[PDB]
Symmetry: C6
Subunit: 221 residues, 6 copies
């Protein structure tokens, strides 16, 4: 990675053994549960493309998912090239060549070139660009690998309201719909698919009640 | 996070793998027991909003609680906006834009903007503001998820006084009443809800006896 | 905490995850055995009041003991205020306000104020003052939670002398009597409460024999 | 290893105990699965030849594989010598001798000479040269130790398409054919060796469908 | 401890949690086996008296041994005072007071005074003086707690010579006789107390054979 | 140890708890398997003689081997003295005394003297000299403690060729013959002591076939 050291300057160092192991274990334990994605982001903080590739390549198994991720990365890289066409010419002293998509994904660039772009003035944050592309691919996999739909989450007749809400928001997190759609699902389905007793009590609260108030309302039900 | 390095200057670095893992395990093991909140605060020391979001987003399950936390954060952010209305105008050289609530919660600000505010002169401690909002939400969850009321904690006839006091103060810690109310509960209920034998001995001590003296008094009872 | 960094200057940093976890496990495993207190001191080296509060607040359970500790801290803080009455007036540029007891215990002071006092010229070692108060409270708890009295430690007829000495000095360590009283207990009781055979052999050594000599003397008995 | 320290300068330090142990455990657990190679690369970041030899020599067992690796290293070293014949003459002040293959592999060079080459202007990246040779040998071993051929991976009649794809791309990763050949295997065999029902559905998608689309298509089959 | 930092200057820091835990576990696992003493020395490298006291005070149980250690420390401290009598007078600016034995053992000196002595010009290595005294006491305990005498180590009739030598040198290590006495034990007893067959073969080697030669000689016996 | 810090200067620090523990566990688990020696070297990187003695002295048990190691160290030290006779005279300002063998082995030198030699201009690498002597002794022990001879490694009639090669090269690694002798063993015995079927197939390859080719040849046999 690259980190702001104890002077304010930015410097390169290798990924720590513990970071590597943490990432490998996360994938082994949690597979593609939604919380894996922010764990990926945290563990890859300040990463170069080489560092990000290291993390992805250290995964054994799940090679359908890793292949899907590769294809998503290829799509993003091709899009980058279209928007940012590389201009032919000899690179001047004290200047970096313009990165292609494959340079951003770390397949046709060296570590020094990556370091060159990331610490340039102005910086070309190639690590953060690639990480954006990776996270897009991870989101696609999390959706793909989710078993349930939000339309199927229904409160059981003896089910504590808190457990139903836990299942509701777990499933919602895996859905790849925008925030406005997620707001509608919260506004519409949560109360609609609650059990008869709770549902009546929540209808009586009326529009605009908080989740806290809803959970306190259906607590002894 | 951001920490005072070995010169006196403040510098950014990523959240350590061990910090991340410590937080995830704390939540897995202890759920929303009161001691989780100071553990959160300790692990999030010097955190940026991005770091704080990382910690919250790495939790799998408990999504009813995490949704309640989000709503509490939205309420605080809306309150901040009301008190601190952003003034329209082009931002001058060597100046930061005024943060909205969503900038403080790390959803509409970048890491560099967050770093910009936190290390400014004078500093806008956006990490500590957001952490205050998070802890408010955590306190609400701890209350919500507490099984027992302080009014129900009664000493059993053969129960050692020390075990009753342990149960009393555990339950008291989860209550979300102010210090003056907590003082009244200590002054009123502890002796009132003790068992007949101990209760008589503690009445005989009179007003203003210490807990130590009370525990020594009822020791062989 | 605060530590003398690699230049000689003192700088603030957060409590390490491992420190926090070490402290939590110590309390879980050993409860209030005497060795917990030096472990507390070691783990809290260079701590600010905020750091010390973090350590105490991260304990779940044992809330009778933690309440007793709070009360002891209140007593010490009230004593400090009596000895050090705060003088009213506007604080000058390049000067710190005088700390009250509650500032020392970290309840009415900020982290920056704490850092202000601890690194001042001359320093007001607020961390070490508070730690002294905490350790007083811990000593009271260790005494309270000790099962046995030193007067009851008697060597069994077939008990190896070394095992009796182990029990003797374990129990002695939990007693809250001064060194001169502890010297008298060693001088008087150890030989007095030994078993008939050993006791005769130790009487024959006479006054002023070392523990080593006593243990070698009763070895094959 | 050697790493860009907190000034921008490069400095030597020993391999960490955790790095060593991580490498030993990786080999113990995963043997020569493909993901071992990027784990090797990550753990050996900034390594000197002495460091790389340490990692290889710490492996107990697998000595057929380690012997094959030695022979591959000898072949590469002999090739280097042919391309880079060492010119006889006394080495001038402020100059390094030209490295032979055995100097690159760390068998006839000292640590200081290795450090001399790696930090020279221009640098002779002897660590990265040797690592390239090692990885060539590791790739040969991974191929050798792979049980299955990509031509034998066929979807079972009741096998979920996702599990077949996992097996397909696991086996493909162990094959030592170029990217163009791997593209042909993906284009040709994946659909060809799918089960009758899925195979018909994938033929209907037509040329140029993505893996994601293929996996969504055969999901309920 | 105190360590030569990255400039050449010496600086104070607290004992690491891992150091503390390592020491506590060593004592729990190995009790007072001879190898505990060099482990103590290693873990206490650059320690102040306060640090050394921390390590000793964190031991729970073994309080007979810890009391013996205290008494040995008192004897050494009294000897120091006799050799180094403190001269009465007001301490000058830029000068340290002369340490008594109790200052060296860390019971009547502060951390800053300890740091004062250890970093003085010329240094008064109070940490290393105290550690010498501690190790003397540990050696006494290891002897005390050794079950066997070197005179009783005799090779069994079917016992491999290598196992007998292991037992011989284990027991020898616990003996508190000087090197010249230990040389005589090696020269005299090892061959003398070997079994009839081996003993004859070793007599035939004659005076001045190495241990290696002796072990190769009796290998198939 | 001593390491090139973040300025280029060399500085002393104590052996890390994890290094110590890693070494102790290595010896406990793997005894004197050949891979222990490079693990020793790695863990002792930049070590002073005091550090190297710490590592050897922390081993409990195996005292026959540790005694053999001591004797080998005495032989090397006596050889050093013969080659480097110490010249009598008062040591000048800004000069180090000439080290004897016992100074190199860390038994008659102080830590500061060791540091004096290792950081001198030109340096006297006393740590690396002693480590060479230790490794000589370790090699002798590994040979001594090897059960099998390379002449006895014969392929079983149903034994996969890869497993035979693993056993062959494991045993070869423990032999203390030079590289030219090891080359002859590879050239002569491997094919000679293979099973009838494989042996015929390997004879047909002819002189100069690689191990890889040999292993591919006998794969389905
Ligand atoms: Cl996996
Ligand atoms: Cl990689
Ligand atoms: Cl790969
Ligand atoms: Cl660009
Ligand atoms: Cl959880
Ligand atoms: Cl996040
Ligand atoms: Cl998220
Ligand atoms: Cl503001
Ligand atoms: Cl607890
Ligand atoms: Cl707190
Ligand atoms: Cl709290
Ligand atoms: Cl004051
Ligand atoms: Cl292995
Ligand atoms: Cl090696
Ligand atoms: Cl080796
Ligand atoms: Cl070259
Ligand atoms: Cl213990
Ligand atoms: Cl202490
Ligand atoms: Cl103590
Ligand atoms: Cl003195
Ligand atoms: Cl061992
Ligand atoms: Cl030692
Ligand atoms: Cl020793
Ligand atoms: Cl010399």
């Amino acid at each position: 990675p690259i980190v702001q050291n104890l002077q304010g300057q930015m410097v390169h160092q290798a990924i720590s053994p513990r970071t590597l192991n943490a990432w490998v274990k996360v994938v082994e334990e949690k597979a593609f549960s939604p919380e894996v994605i922010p764990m990926f982001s945290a563990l890859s903080a300040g990463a170069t493309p080489q560092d990000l590739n290291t993390m992805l390549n250290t995964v054994g198994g799940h090679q359908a998912a890793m292949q899907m991720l590769k294809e998503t990365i290829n799509e993003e890289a091709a899009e980058w090239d279209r928007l940012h066409p590389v201009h032919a010419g000899p690179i001047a002293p004290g200047q970096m060549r313009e990165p292609r998509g494959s340079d951003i994904a770390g397949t046709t660039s060296t570590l020094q070139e990556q370091i060159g772009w990331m610490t340039h003035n102005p910086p070309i944050p190639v690590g953060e660009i690639y990480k954006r592309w990776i996270i897009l691919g991870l989101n696609k996999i999390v959706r793909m690998y989710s078993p349930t739909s939000i339309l199927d989450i229904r409160q059981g007749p003896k089910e504590p309201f808190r457990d139903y809400v836990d299942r509701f928001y777990k499933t919602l997190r895996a859905e790849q719909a925008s925030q406005e759609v997620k707001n509608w699902m919260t506004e519409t389905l949560l109360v609609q698919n609650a059990n008869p007793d709770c549902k009546t009590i929540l209808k009586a609260l009326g529009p605009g009640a908080t989740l806290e108030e809803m959970m306190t309302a259906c607590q002894g039900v």
